[PDB]
Every structure is written in C-alpha cells, then in structure tokens.
Design a protein around this ligand. Structure first.
Ligand SMILES: O=C(O)CNC(=O)C(=O)O
Ligand SMILES: [Mg+2]
Ligand code: NI
Ligand SMILES: [Zn+2]
Length: 331
C-alpha cells in the first residue's frame, strides 16, 4: 500500500506532465497521495498563471466577512459578520494596517504559535467565496476555470445528464483569516492555487480517519452536535493542533506559498489560516474515484449549511433516499 503513514506528498511535475490534469491526479493517487487528504503541487518553472498581478485592485469584494470567534484558544467557533463592500485595493490597505497586519515573527512555526495563542482575540476580515478567476485565458495547463466539470464527470461515469455548473472562487485573505474544519460539498476534491501574497497554513486529517475527527468534534461542540448530525458542514468549528494531539487524532500540516497548488481529496477534513494579505483561487472537481464518496457523503439538513445550485442534482442522483429531507433543509 503506497503512503501507509498518510503523509502529505509534494509533487514537482515537468512541463510535459503538466499537460494532462486528470492523468496527473491519477498518478498522484497511484503514489498514495490521497491517503493524506491533501497534496502540494509545485508547477514547472516554465509555467505561469498569468503575466502580472498589477491590475487586480479594482476587483470588488461585495460582502467582506469579519470572522468573530467564541470559545477558548484551541477550541472555538467563528461567525461571519457581513461588512460593507470594498475593492481589493481597499482590502489590501486594510490588511496592511496596524490593526490587521502580520506581527513580527521568526519563521512559519513562530507565526503558527502566535496564531493559535491569539487568534480568538481578534476579528480579521476575509474576502471569501467571490466567483471569478485570475488565470489568463491563454494559460492552458492547470487553469482552474477550464477544468472538466463535475456534471460532465457524473455523466461520463453514470450516464445521467444533469443541470448545474462548476466555476471557481477567489479568496482574499489577511493575517488570521481562518478556514474552519470541513470536507468539500459532497466530499468532492478541491484544488487551490495561491496566486499572490503571504502563505496559507493547512491542517488535514487522512480520509481513512475522518470519523475520528467527527467524534472529537461532537465531544467538543456538544450543542452544535445536538443541533445537526453533520454540523461540520456549517464550516464554523476550529480545533488546534495541540488539541488534536491531546486527543490522538491523526493529522498533518503544511504551509502553501504563492505559486503553489494544493489538492484536497474526497473526505479529507482540512482547516487553516492565512499569514497575511493574499489571494487564492479554488474550485471543486471530481474523478471516477469520487463517485463512491459522493454516494456516502453526510449531509446537513438542519438548514444551516445552505449551498450552491449544483448540489441539488448530486444529492438527487447519488443519494435519492436523502433527497427529500436534504431539500427541506435547503427551503
Ligand atoms: O483557502 C481557503 O480559505 C479555503 N479553501 C479551501 O477549503 C479549499 O481550497 O478547499
Ligand atoms: Mg482590477
Ligand atoms: Ni476546502
Ligand atoms: Zn446543519
């Protein structure tokens, strides 16, 4: 069995290997990469996403989210308070202000310590989930706006044509902006490219151990767990590495830098934080190996998780017994 300890693997494809996305995902899996839940892909030196980032300041963040925490430093939830719209140039200035800027630090480990110690005492503002793309249309390799769609994959695998579309999202971050513990909608893959700026630290639980994380989460968030049998779908709970180690939960960590891709694999729980002003682009995707995960994915039906148009068909076709209850949650 490849990668039996479920370590995060890092890949350095050549320019020839970077041509065929599906084939390279399948290669990574042949080497055991999925067992970690997360892999890093460093593009060949010949490649670029676009020519420059000098002209992005006028992109609008229509609904910046202030991430307010509740709890204790290692075990907290966050809620998202909506703020007034601002441009990416306005948000960059905000991120660099004395109130929000990254503190002085020695290295990524010192910054990680500072994050876990102090996150809860601040409310950073995240420009998340903005439909759009920063890939040049002429970038032919690993262009996250030109991937095969999940609807087309389901059709290729299962023969059923469905409605829906699949487009990427931009994330503009600052110090301490946080992504809560989650798997993707319908336990899909995700791919995330860090276009510019400061790093993003990730934590991940191997898919084979995801239920251990869920059982901890039910213990640590007992009211939330009573409210919803899949409350990590709400994407609000944080648990620190120290707490995970104290409870024996298997996980790994890695820091993504600008110019690097990360891939999350079906049912790989992940969480993390941004080091400073940055911009990432991410999208979900599927492969043949996903289908069995999609059929078994948990679902939130309490009404909180509220998701995209295109999840309807995935539930309807892969999970027809759950469909009626899930759809009640959506309405
Ligand atoms: O970058 C972020 O805030 C969150 N991204 C992801 O969870 C992802 O790419 O799957
Ligand atoms: Mg612009
Ligand atoms: Ni994710
Ligand atoms: Zn719920």
């Amino acid at each position: 069995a490849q990668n039996p300890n479920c370590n995060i693997m890092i890949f350095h494809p050549t320019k020839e290997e970077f041509n065929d996305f599906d084939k390279y995902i399948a290669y990574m899996e042949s080497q055991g990469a999925h067992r970690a839940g997360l892999a890093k892909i460093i593009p060949p030196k010949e490649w670029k996403a676009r020519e420059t980032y000098d002209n992005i300041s006028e992109i609008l963040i229509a609904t910046p989210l202030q991430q307010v925490a509740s709890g204790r430093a290692g075990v907290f939830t966050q809620y998202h308070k909506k703020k007034k719209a601002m441009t990416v140039g306005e948000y960059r200035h905000l991120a660099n202000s004395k109130k929000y800027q990254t503190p002085p630090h020695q290295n990524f480990e010192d910054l990680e310590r500072k994050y876990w110690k102090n996150r809860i005492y601040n409310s950073p503002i995240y420009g998340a989930d903005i439909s759009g793309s920063l890939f040049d249309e002429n970038t032919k390799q690993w262009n996250l706006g030109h991937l095969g769609t999940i609807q087309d994959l389901l059709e290729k695998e299962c023969g059923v044509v469905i409605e829906g579309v699949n487009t990427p999202y931009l994330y503009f971050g600052m110090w301490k902006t946080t992504f809560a513990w989650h798997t993707e909608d319908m336990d899909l893959y995700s791919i995330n490219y860090l276009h510019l700026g400061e790093p993003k630290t990730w934590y991940v639980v191997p898919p084979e151990h995801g239920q251990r994380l869920e059982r901890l989460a039910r213990e640590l968030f007992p009211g939330s767990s009573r409210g919803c049998g899949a409350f990590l779908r709400h994407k609000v709970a944080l648990i620190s590495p120290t707490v995970l180690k104290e409870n024996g939960i298997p996980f790994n960590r890695i820091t993504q830098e600008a110019g690097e891709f990360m891939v999350t694999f079906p049912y790989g729980y992940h969480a993390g934080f941004n080091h400073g002003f940055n911009c990432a682009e991410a999208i979900n995707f599927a492969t043949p190996r996903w289908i069995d995960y999609g059929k078994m994915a948990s679902q939130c039906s309490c009404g909180e998780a509220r998701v995209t148009f295109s999840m309807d068909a995935f539930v309807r076709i892969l999970q027809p017994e759950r469909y009626d209850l899930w759809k009640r949650g959506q309405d």
